């Protein structure tokens, strides 16, 4: 219902969206464009990394999980710098920067 109506943005529907990708997909189907019970890409993209930074998404020591969160929200610079710090994934982060360049 609230995937069709883009409502109840605060309720993460955790009963059915238990994975991270299920959350991203749940919200990107809820973002809106031009006051209550409404979320926009700017709020969502900022809300995610500002409040729930790397710390929240890298506790499982899985780096790509956070990268996908930033890249699939149009925050390409964040995801590039972030992934560029993983000494094992420097190569990959430089190139995804070149492509964007």
């Amino acid at each position: 219902y609230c995937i069709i109506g883009r409502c109840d943005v605060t309720d993460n529907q955790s009963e059915v969206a238990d994975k991270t990708e299920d959350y991203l997909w749940l919200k990107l189907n809820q973002v809106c464009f031009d006051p209550q019970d409404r979320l926009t890409l700017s709020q969502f993209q900022k809300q995610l990394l500002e409040d729930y930074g790397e710390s929240h998404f890298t506790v499982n020591q899985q780096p790509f999980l956070y990268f996908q969160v930033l890249f699939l929200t149009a925050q390409f610079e964040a995801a590039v710098a972030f992934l560029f710090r993983m000494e094992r994934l420097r190569c990959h982060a430089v190139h995804v920067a070149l492509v964007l360049f």
Binding site: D18, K19, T20, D22, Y23, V59
Partner: peptide, 8 residues
Amino acid sequence: APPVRSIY
């Protein structure tokens, strides 16, 4: 309260 469990 988003989960941190990656789709595996």
